[PDB]
TrEMBL record, chain D:
Function description: Provides the signal sequence for the translocation of the precursor of protein E3/E2 to the host endoplasmic reticulum. Furin-cleaved E3 remains associated with spike glycoprotein E1 and mediates pH protection of the latter during the transport via the secretory pathway. After virion release from the host cell, the assembly protein E3 is gradually released in the extracellular space. Acts as a viroporin that participates in virus glycoprotein processing and transport to the plasma membrane, cell permeabilization and budding of viral particles. Disrupts the calcium homeostasis of the cell, probably at the endoplasmic reticulum level. This leads to cytoplasmic calcium elevation. Because of its lipophilic properties, the 6K protein is postulated to influence the selection of lipids that interact with the transmembrane domains of the glycoproteins, which, in turn, affects the deformability of the bilayer required for the extreme curvature that occurs as budding proceeds.
Section of the entire sequence shown: 435 to 487 of 1248
Assembly notes: Homodimer. Homomultimer. Interacts with host karyopherin KPNA4; this interaction allows the nuclear import of the viral capsid protein. Interacts with spike glycoprotein E2. Interacts with host IRAK1; the interaction leads to inhibition of IRAK1-dependent signaling. The precursor of protein E3/E2 and E1 form a heterodimer shortly after synthesis.
Cell location: Host Golgi apparatus, Host trans-Golgi network; Host cell membrane; Host cytoplasm; Host endoplasmic reticulum
Name of the protein in question: Structural polyprotein
The organism's taxonomic lineage, starting at the top: Viruses, Riboviria, Orthornavirae, Kitrinoviricota, Alsuviricetes
Domain of life, source organism: Viruses
Length: 98, 97, 315, 53, 53
């Protein structure tokens, strides 16, 4: 199972933020304009408009991938092995061989 | 996306990751600082519920299945050519019997 | 240990539903719920910090939260997590909570404030622990067998997995700028603030003491606390400090995903009666139980069905 | 079913239970459970907090 | 406020559109022709479904 890594959004108080580029496995960036975010105390941005938020995210393997995972293999050819019990000389003895 | 294998990796400790989950961002909703997105859920969290019966229960010939390593025990197909090399001391002479 | 938690402080963040169908910024803003453990445990990341008091001295009986500008203290007894029924909390360490919860389609966590105020944040979350084994049981039984599963272990010795920390952004707060004679003065209150005004002078800068403007209106200015010595996690729902992250770090987070055997019940013996090339089985399931059969020849002809109540089957 | 009660001044608990099939209607085209961070807004009706009877 | 469902994974065939649907909760799927006879149909999807319209 994957995980999406979302860093804190960058919101520019004035003007338009610039979209970057990365090589991350599913990187995706987008710039949204005209935002007007509110924090707990008051408006974050000074002016009522012209504010652009830079939202970016990408995916990455989760921490559980060490333990919780599924392995895809290919089965070429089976090396048969066997274990046998034989009453050799009237006494049970065991033989393990390929 | 969504099906088994949306994210693949060569080894559990490998760093190269290929992931196809069509992650698409979306506009923030009316004066909030969150980052919304629309991503296909995990294909492996889906496969785990959609697994169905494994070979341990569906294999033919009364076949058992184990792991570490993967095996198939007590299959009932075919016959076993068993060749012995019984020493002369093993036999008893016919006059003795 | 809590050595890393000295440099970082909690933070208010947006919550979709603060208990009454409305959204407001709360100290308990739930961050991320992960349910990778096959045994049904959960690891909840919340904006609180549990087990460490305001003076950064570790104490398992207290938690600290961001109240306006200064972190405060609250008892850990009042901390609760609920999904549909009250949930048992099996471990807390800083931002992270373990809990074993009943099945439900939502999740909420909360606490009680030092001023006897109640805070909570409820999130949509489809919790439905996967079935382990072939019987859908509800509690571990006296008698049964053991099957492997995965579990968030209790070890707080955080290793092998980190969350980043960043410099907090400016905290806008219009309460700082009180108006007298139509003029802003910015009471500051001993903490560094950054101010900007829409008056003709277009004055702006960083100040540390009361600074009356005498010209700007109260609605034509903006004051925000700017200097921050403590760090915080770069939550995806707080604005970033700048185009890049600074004053970084890595807080190892607790409760690694161990693996351990879990106990599952064994269904009671069916009553069997034999017919010619037939077996008549009377089944007594106490919970949705899975019955499977196959031919032990070349063609297995595998068939299965969850028997949820007493049945009679002919094979 | 719906039950409402209170604890008396004599430390006694009173309660009343009526059968009441509570199943709130679905708004829109999704049977969601808790209001989300992101979505759209549809008209609905609520009992206002105002006591200006 | 009401939620919006995740984008389906649409793939196209010869006069066919194939959808995988990822509902977090019971979601309604409606479709109709845009001609004289709409042939309206609908279905409440509760889990992941493969749909061929």
């Amino acid at each position: 199972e994957y995980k999406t890594v979302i860093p804190s959004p960058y919101v520019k108080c004035c003007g338009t933020a610039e979209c970057k580029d990365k090589s991350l496995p599913d990187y995706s960036c987008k710039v949204f304009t005209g935002v007007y975010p509110f924090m707990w105390g008051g408006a974050y941005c000074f002016c009522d408009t012209e504010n652009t938020q830079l939202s970016e995210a990408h995916v990455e393997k989760s921490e559980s991938c060490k333990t919780e995972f599924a392995s895809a293999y290919r089965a070429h050819t089976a090396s048969a092995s066997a274990k046998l019990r034989v009453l050799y000389q009237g006494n049970n003895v065991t033989v393990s061989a390929y | 996306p969504g099906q088994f294998g949306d994210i693949q990796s060569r080894t559990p400790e490998s760093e190269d990751v290929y992931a196809n989950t069509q992650l698409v961002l979306q506009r923030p909703s009316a004066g909030t600082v969150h980052v919304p997105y629309s991503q296909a859920p995990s294909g492996f969290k889906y496969w785990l519920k959609e697994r169905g019966a494994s070979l341990q229960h569906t294999a033919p010939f009364g076949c058992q299945i184990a792991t570490n390593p993967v095996r198939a025990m007590n299959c009932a197909v075919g016959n076993m050519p068993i060749s012995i090399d019984i020493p002369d001391a093993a036999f008893t002479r016919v006059v003795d019997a | 240990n809590f050595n890393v938690y000295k440099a970082i402080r909690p933070y208010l963040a947006h919550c979709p539903d603060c208990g009454e169908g409305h959204s407001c910024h709360s100290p308990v803003a739930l961050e991320r719920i992960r349910n990778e453990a096959t045994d049904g445990t959960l690891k909840i990341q919340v904006s609180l910090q549990i087990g460490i008091k305001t003076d950064d001295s570790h104490d398992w009986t207290k938690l600290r939260y961001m109240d306006n500008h200064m972190p405060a203290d609250a008892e850990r007894a009042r901390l609760f997590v609920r999904t549909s029924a009250p949930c048992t909390i099996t471990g807390t360490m800083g931002h992270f909570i373990l809990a074993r919860c009943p099945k439900g389609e939502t999740l909420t966590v909360g606490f009680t404030d030092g001023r006897k105020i109640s805070h909570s944040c409820t999130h949509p979350f489809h919790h439905d622990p996967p079935v382990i084994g072939r019987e859908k049981f509800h509690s571990r039984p006296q008698h049964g067998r053991e099957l492997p599963c995965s579990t968030y272990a209790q070890s707080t010795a955080a290793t092998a997995e980190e969350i980043e920390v960043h410099m907090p952004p400016d905290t806008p707060d219009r309460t700082l700028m009180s108006q007298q004679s139509g003029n802003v003065k910015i009471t500051v209150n001993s903490q560094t603030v950054r101010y900007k005004c829409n008056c003709g002078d277009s004055n702006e800068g960083l100040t540390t003491t009361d600074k009356v403007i005498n010209n700007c209106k109260v609605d034509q200015c903006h004051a925000a606390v700017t200097n921050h010595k403590k760090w915080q996690y770069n939550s995806p729902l707080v604005p970033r400090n700048a185009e890049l992250g600074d004053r970084k770090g890595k807080v190892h987070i607790p409760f690694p995903l161990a693996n351990v055997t879990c106990r599952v019940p064994k269904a009671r013996n069916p009553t069997v009666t034999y017919g010619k090339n037939q077996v008549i089985m009377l089944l007594y399931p106490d919970h949705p139980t899975l019955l499977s059969y196959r031919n032990m020849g070349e063609e297995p002809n595998y068939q299965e069905e969850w028997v949820t109540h007493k049945k009679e089957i002919r094979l």
